Amino acid sequence: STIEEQAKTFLDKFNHEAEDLFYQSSLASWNYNTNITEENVQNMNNAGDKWSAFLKEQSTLAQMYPLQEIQNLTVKLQLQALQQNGSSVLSEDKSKRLNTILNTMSTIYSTGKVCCLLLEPGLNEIMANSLDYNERLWAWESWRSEVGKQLRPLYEEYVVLKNEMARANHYEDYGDYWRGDYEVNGVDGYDYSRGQLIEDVEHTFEEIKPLYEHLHAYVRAKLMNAYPSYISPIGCLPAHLLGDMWGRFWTNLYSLTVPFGQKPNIDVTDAMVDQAWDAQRIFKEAEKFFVSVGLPNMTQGFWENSMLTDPGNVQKAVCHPTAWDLGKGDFRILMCTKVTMDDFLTAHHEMGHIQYDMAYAAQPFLLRNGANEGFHEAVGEIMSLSAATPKHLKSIGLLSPDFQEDNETEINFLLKQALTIVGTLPFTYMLEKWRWMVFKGEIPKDQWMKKWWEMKREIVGVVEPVPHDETYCDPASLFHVSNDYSFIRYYTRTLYQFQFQEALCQAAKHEGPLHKCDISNSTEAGQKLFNMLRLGKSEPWTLALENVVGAKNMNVRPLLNYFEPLFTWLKDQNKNSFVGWSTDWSPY
Amino acid sequence: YNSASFSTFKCYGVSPTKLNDLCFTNVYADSFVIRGDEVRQIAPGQTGKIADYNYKLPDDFTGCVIAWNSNNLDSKVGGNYNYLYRLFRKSNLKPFERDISTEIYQAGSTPCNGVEGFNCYFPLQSYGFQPTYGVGYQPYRVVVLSFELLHAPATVCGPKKSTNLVKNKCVNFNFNGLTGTGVLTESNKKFLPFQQF
Ligand SMILES: *[C@@H]1O[C@H](CO)[C@@H](O)[C@H](O)[C@H]1NC(C)=O
Ligand SMILES: *[C@@H]1O[C@H](CO)[C@@H](O)[C@H](O)[C@H]1NC(C)=O
Ligand SMILES: *[C@@H]1O[C@H](CO)[C@@H](O)[C@H](O)[C@H]1NC(C)=O
Ligand SMILES: *[C@@H]1O[C@H](CO)[C@@H](O)[C@H](O)[C@H]1NC(C)=O
Ligand SMILES: *[C@@H]1O[C@H](CO)[C@@H](O)[C@H](O)[C@H]1NC(C)=O
Ligand SMILES: *[C@@H]1O[C@H](CO)[C@@H](O)[C@H](O)[C@H]1NC(C)=O
Ligand SMILES: [Zn+2]
């Protein structure tokens, strides 16, 4: 018959037994994670191997159908997802070499000694709490010399093989292959292009440049009090003084830079301990929140199958917070819940993840995902933004019934949140732009470090303490770069999060500042959110964004609206100090 | 009807209260296991994989449908795969038609001599059932009852409620359909042991 009918029959066959093998593999993985032992590893590996073999065979079988004949725009999407030949185009020797390179990178990064003083055992704590210039500089330079110097030629060979493999798949570069996620075709008025993503990020960064400039000026002004003879009024911040090994986040800098240190922050750990919460009432409150929003209940097997506390001494288990979608109507949460506010907020986050997972369960197997890579973490996170408000905690009995808040606490909270939200965007933008240029071939192999540090000086305003030759490979020290991970998701996530927050807050008829807003007891906002949640990957992400915010493309104006009083206070504070940095100045 | 241990108990075209005492020519019973999600498919006018290729219901149904959860019965750790279901079929199914054909279903124009491969699929698929499955994913035991009515004498009837007996007081009565009014009292003449009236 027609190709469309045959493709429909083939997809109908695949979805069944695809769900079965996926459920078997997920159950094996959960059994290993919840109960670590020698025996479970074999089962997990066998299940993974079986699933991978089945997936490769099904892709090989699906290669037969020409994509042009299908005119359904959903069967076409499923086929496009399934006919991902990808890395198998490489020769057997080339594939073996690439796998060996990746494995060597993972092994060398996992076990790195600068002595004895491993990355997580030591090093991290030194870079976060030394407060001593020499110790931090020594740790930074030692880690760089031990790791990045040895990851240079492996990274070069990785670049060349990955670029050739990406070109083998009818793509220009590997960066284009990464950018292929933000691409929707075939829909009039909703289409998007991979060459559109290279722009539309520079525009937002140019928009958000003044706020970052003011924040950097304020941080440098407050930091020159310490380290008296190592910081210049005009210039860039030394690289090792950002409170982190790579400077990805500025959270550790909060203790040094507080606007009003007299006023304590809001902390309800003692309130939780006084009422003796049993580590399950936290998830009960999360379920109460999501029910009051308007979203449905939790499954009956969720409360019994999932484990929400440390198993004990006899049974060992890794319990990094994780939400499990095993399929076949199975939802689970892996958490070592304790009586803390952070555990409360992360329980809200994972509960939102589970609620997002429940939304698109009716969709076919291939379309059970978010619209893009940024639509999921933002949905999970806006729940924590809503639950972190003082109004919600006052509504609960944990907070004091008679609590009076001053704008000093508002400034403290706004700065504390900004040091993590707006402190990481330039770093992500610079790192992704550098990787894109490296993959594109604009930067010759002899000018990697010079261009990297030039971008660090120009865009981020961070200068290296000691010069690095071309033998060093500083970007390879990061976990994501060496282990083949994309990085623009963290840039898109905050924009999507703030757009969703503004849309849900305006749908809830809220008045006043955006940072005091709460979406609880609002059924219409929950319905608007669930309208987008139930779509899954069936529809283009532009239409999903329009279904909530109302705009096709991402906008950063809500982000600036969130941080407006803080911007005004910084402008008032920085009216006397210098704003901006000079590239010429160097520590040496 | 008063057990209240069944998830679904619906009678189509007949009232459960009135049918509790009624006479029918014959009654048909059927039993099978479906997924809890597929429960809604078992209804007249419905369409689905179960409805089209596994079991068809005539629209003018004259019986009842009873459904309840069976998770504790046929759902085991590792999956209970002893129950099959037709996922691929050449056409639909007529009402009350049983199909047990196991020919390799062919999708494309090219025939396959009973060999699985491209454009060739097995018509029957197995069911996975575990206690950790979803509520709609859990196995369900469903029984459907159909009532037959013809010109032949009826055989099945509802349990007639028998009242008490009183005497020496002129009251209305009805014995085995014989109605009337009068005074009830004992006698002496004895019938033969096959006569009434
Ligand atoms: C974890 O696995 C071990 C295997 O030696 C087993 O003895 C133990 O019962 C398991 N714990 C469970 C199932 O809670
Ligand atoms: C695509 O096929 C599905 C069934 O597989 C159908 O529901 C849908 O309407 C089709 N799309 C269009 C545009 O007709
Ligand atoms: C998979 O390999 C075949 C080899 O014939 C090639 O034609 C096809 O384009 C590949 N699929 C891709 C690159 O997506
Ligand atoms: C479903 O949510 C409602 C809303 O409050 C609640 O009353 C009910 O107990 C919930 N049922 C289950 C089974 O969770
Ligand atoms: C939401 O409604 C509940 C219902 O009584 C109430 O207790 C709670 O204070 C309300 N919270 C907000 C923020 O309106
Ligand atoms: C905000 O906080 C500052 C802290 O010094 C205080 O002087 C001021 O009165 C507060 N309110 C406003 C509206 O600025
Ligand atoms: Zn998350």
PDB file of N, CA and C and ligand atoms in Angstrom, chain A residues 349-350 353 377, ligand 7:
ATOM      1  N   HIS A 349      10.868  20.833  43.704  1.00  0.00           N
ATOM      2  CA  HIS A 349      11.409  20.771  42.350  1.00  0.00           C
ATOM      3  C   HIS A 349      11.169  19.401  41.721  1.00  0.00           C
ATOM      4  N   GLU A 350      11.528  18.331  42.437  1.00  0.00           N
ATOM      5  CA  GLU A 350      11.338  16.984  41.902  1.00  0.00           C
ATOM      6  C   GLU A 350       9.859  16.643  41.755  1.00  0.00           C
ATOM      7  N   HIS A 353       8.889  18.063  38.609  1.00  0.00           N
ATOM      8  CA  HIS A 353       9.395  17.216  37.533  1.00  0.00           C
ATOM      9  C   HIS A 353       8.459  16.037  37.294  1.00  0.00           C
ATOM     10  N   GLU A 377      13.520  21.882  32.963  1.00  0.00           N
ATOM     11  CA  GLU A 377      14.106  22.374  34.204  1.00  0.00           C
ATOM     12  C   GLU A 377      13.429  23.662  34.653  1.00  0.00           C
TER      13      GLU A 377
HETATM   14 ZN    ZN C   7      15.686  19.507  37.695  1.00  0.00          ZN
END
